[PDB]
Design a protein around this ligand. Structure first.
Ligand code: SF4
Ligand SMILES: [Zn+2]
Lengths: 677, 118
DNA sequence: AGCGCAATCAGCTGTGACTACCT
DNA sequence: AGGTAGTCACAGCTGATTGCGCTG
């Protein structure tokens, strides 16, 4: 229906609008009228996207001049496809409610592997070689030699798109990635090239974070698209981590071995301009000098260039030219493929980063390995320390950057973690006919001994027995699915080993099946599949995993999957490896951020992010427990999102295992009754 | 440009201006005696200041976070400028005599409480 | 051994009835 | 010979002190 905002009417596919959605629309309209950025926090993954798109379309219709381009950067490809299909549903609703079409174009962007039609590159699973093969098949030299019609195998989609697809536009009709591929294959055009041509003449477009956070591709994909545009980062609770990883590179023995292997081939090709031919040869030994040095750590972000200009005595000026040399010398050398060549490009990227970015970074060398620390492994990584650098080139190029996710409880730390000027300070807590979640914090066990996962008490037998008892008698009350997140893989395996040693793991087995998530991707996928198939029937299952793992955020536990989420201790990141402590010191001496406050913020952010995936949809319900007394302290509860705070009553903040089980039983019994709409 | 209150020489950026909005250059920064930094608990105990008096009474008082030398896992110390703390105490309590009477009556009340507990 | 959340004491007050002193 | 303000018991609140915990 038509929702009447204070100064506009907006069509919405769903007749009924929840108060949270209405308040969200009010706040977003206020921000758009304020011409400023903002941060938002909503508890529903679904229903936020439709409201966002509806308000965006209404604002564009009312003010075509104020807003011209929309960006909906998300985390992965499933989010892209679901937002595209939701936009398609919205457009279908608008067509069926209005009767006339509109000249609005919406496309989804992804990598070369996602959008390609050649059968010679699809079967392979090399993401770093598909771009190189695509460049080799079609490039400037390919276009130049196509005039003579050279008899050689090459891609021909571009050779038809440049002569037929650069004239006919697509004013109307939003196209999904599969639709783009179908159009490209029926018209003999490359989907990527037609997307590149049609982004200029487009209304909305969605892609991943890496196309804006990484400077090496943001300029190519967004240079003069729109001076005044709206960008939104949905599910951006970990925006700082990806921003840090944007300017983070790693070096090891394999990388330098590959570089020394391929430099001989490069020299052989060259001997068949001179400013870099001799420049590239002696760069390897400077970094291999650290390989032979048996030292713990060396830190010198400003003095790294000074040290480089002593052993080899090279000026700082030529370092910045690597970026412009990459696009020039390589295309003249006619590289056959990017295989066995990416480390050379990453070395140039590292050199450019250290030459240009040296104010808020640090160089760390880590000669440590898991289970084999000191054999041969000096690991050099240019770890980023400030999250503002990856977010600067978007705040100054846009007007209403919005950070929204399901876990953004502290709105006073994000504006200081990254340079930001919020004007919203807005949070929304969902309301339903009944409370769909039962958050509670379990402290001491039945023996009145705290189950805190403190480092000095990790090896304690009493706390391990209490954790096992909690998981056992909890598994008898919540049916068809329990998700348990541990602090780390080492703690998880040490706890399950102790459970196996005692006669307690058998009692858990006879209630629900035990599934352990490991680092292997195929093993994790098959374990998830069998966990789902066990949850489908009445057998029940337990999913044991780690809070900081690829399975914590890779999947969503929709209703009847994972009715209970258990947090075994506060998930604290490893303070070792001398990487976290550098960031802690940088935030201490730069943003005046307390180290304890930042650690608690990260721990609670991860805990809330991994515990809020059990509530997807109004009808969905789930049980949330926190098996640590440290959660009971106010400084950690206050970091939980507002949609969980009001449901966490003061009655259950330190209750034992038995009373937690009783509360879970009452909640589950009272949540099985029919409800209304 | 910012004019120093001590020498008057124009400067663009200075440590005191950056950290406490104090218009004083680094050359005149007498951080040893005049601009000494004290911990938050020590300032609260000496000047009988509260959190509201430090963060909500205009103007707000900034602070510098530094690592604790004694223990890495322990709380980082919050350091406030002594001049700003003195000015805030004088503005809140009116005069130094009021603060000197307040500390005496507080210790007298502490003695009264301990003898009552006994 | 500096912060910060939480346990603790002081001062005032409500509810109800019992009790000492004197015009 | 009669009646009202202290007073005790038991509870509440808010306003400070002050004392134990605080990261793999
Ligand atoms: S030009 Fe397009 S179709 Fe051809 S190889 Fe590259 S991505 Fe694939
Ligand atoms: Zn001066």
């Amino acid at each position: 229906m038509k929702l009447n905002v204070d100064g506009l009417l907006v069509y919405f596919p769903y007749d009924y609008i929840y108060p949270e959605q209405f308040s969200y629309m009010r706040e977003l309209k206020r921000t758009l009228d304020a011409k400023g950025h903002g941060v938002l926090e909503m508890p529903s993954g679904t229903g936020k996207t439709v409201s966002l798109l509806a308000l965006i379309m209404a604002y564009q219709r009312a003010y075509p001049l104020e807003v011209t381009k929309l960006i909906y950067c998300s985390r992965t490809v499933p989010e892209i496809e679901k937002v595209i299909e939701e936009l398609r549903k919205l457009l279908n609703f608008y067509e069926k409610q209005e009767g006339e079409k509109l000249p609005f174009l919406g496309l989804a962007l992804s990598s070369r592997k996602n959008l390609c039609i050649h059968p010679e590159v699809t079967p392979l699973r090399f993401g770093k070689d598909v771009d190189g093969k695509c460049h080799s098949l079609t490039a400037s030299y390919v276009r130049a030699q196509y005039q003579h019609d050279t008899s050689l195998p090459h891609c021909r989609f571009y050779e038809e798109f440049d002569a037929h697809g650069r004239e006919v536009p697509l004013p109307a009709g939003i196209y999904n990635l599969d639709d783009l591929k179908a159009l490209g294959r029926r018209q003999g055009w490359c989907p990527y090239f037609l997307a590149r041509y049609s982004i200029l003449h487009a209304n909305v477009v969605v892609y991943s974070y890496h196309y804006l956070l990484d400077p090496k591709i943001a300029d190519l994909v967004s240079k003069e698209l729109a001076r005044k545009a709206v960008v939104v980062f949905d599910e951006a609770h970990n925006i700082d981590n990806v921003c840090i990883d944007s300017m983070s590179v790693n070096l090891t023995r394999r990388t330098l071995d590959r570089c020394q292997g391929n430099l001989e081939t490069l020299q052989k090709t060259v001997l068949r301009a001179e400013h870099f031919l001799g420049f590239l040869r002696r760069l390897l030994e400077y970094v291999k000098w650290r390989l032979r040095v048996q030292h713990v750590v060396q830190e010198s972000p400003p003095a790294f260039l000074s040290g480089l200009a002593q052993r080899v005595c090279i000026q700082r000026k030529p370092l910045r030219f690597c970026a412009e040399r990459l696009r020039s010398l390589l295309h003249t050398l006619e590289i056959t493929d990017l295989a066995d060549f990416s480390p050379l490009t990453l070395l140039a990227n590292f050199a450019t980063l250290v030459s240009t970015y040296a104010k808020g970074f640090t160089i760390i060398i880590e000669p440590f390995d898991d289970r084999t620390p000191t054999i041969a492994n000096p690991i050099l990584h240019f770890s980023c320390m400030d999250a503002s650098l990856a977010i600067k080139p978007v705040f100054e190029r846009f007007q209403s950057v919005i950070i929204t996710s399901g876990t953004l409880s502290p709105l006073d730390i994000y504006p200081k973690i990254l340079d930001f000027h919020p004007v919203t300070m807005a949070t929304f807590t969902m309301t339903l006919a009944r409370v769909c979640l039962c958050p509670m914090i379990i402290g001491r066990g039945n023996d009145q001994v705290a189950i805190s996962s403190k480092f000095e008490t990790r090896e304690d037998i009493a706390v391990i027995r209490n954790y096992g008892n909690l998981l056992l008698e909890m598994s008898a009350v919540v049916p068809d699915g329990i998700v348990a997140f541990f602090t780390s893989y080492q703690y998880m395996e040490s706890t399950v080993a102790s459970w196996y040693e005692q006669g307690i793991l058998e009692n858990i087995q006879r209630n629900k099946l035990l599934f352990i998530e490991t680092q292997d991707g195929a093993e994790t996928s098959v374990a998830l599949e069998k966990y789902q198939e066990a949850c489908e029937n009445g057998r029940g299952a337990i999913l044991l995993s780690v809070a900081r793992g690829k399975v914590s955020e890779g999947i969503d536990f929709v209703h009847h999957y994972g009715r209970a989420v258990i947090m075994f201790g506060v998930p604290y990141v490893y303070t070792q490896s001398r990487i976290l402590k550098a960031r802690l010191e940088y935030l201490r001496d730069q943003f005046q951020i307390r180290e304890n406050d930042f650690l608690t913020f990260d721990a609670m952010r991860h805990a809330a992010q991994c515990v809020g995936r059990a509530i997807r949809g109004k009808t969905d319900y789930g049980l949330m427990v926190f098996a640590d007394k440290r959660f009971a302290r106010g400084d950690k509860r206050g970091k939980l999102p507002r949609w969980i705070q009001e449901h966490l009553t003061d009655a259950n903040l330190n209750l034992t295992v038995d009373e937690g089980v009783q509360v879970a039983k009452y909640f589950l019994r009272q949540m099985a009754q029919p409800f209304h709409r | 440009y910012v004019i120093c209150e001590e020498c008057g020489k124009e400067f663009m950026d200075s440590y005191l201006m950056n950290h406490f909005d104090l218009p004083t250059c680094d050359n005149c920064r007498d951080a040893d005696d005049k601009h000494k930094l004290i911990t938050k608990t020590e300032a609260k105990q000496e000047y009988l200041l509260k959190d509201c008096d430090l963060e909500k009474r205009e103007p707000p008082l900034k602070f510098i976070v530094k690592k604790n030398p004694h223990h890495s896992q322990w709380g980082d110390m919050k350091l406030y400028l002594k001049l700003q703390i003195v000015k805030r105490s004088l503005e809140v309590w009116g005069s130094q005599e009021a603060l000197e009477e307040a500390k005496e009556v507080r210790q007298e009340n502490r003695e009264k409480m301990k003898q009552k507990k006994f």
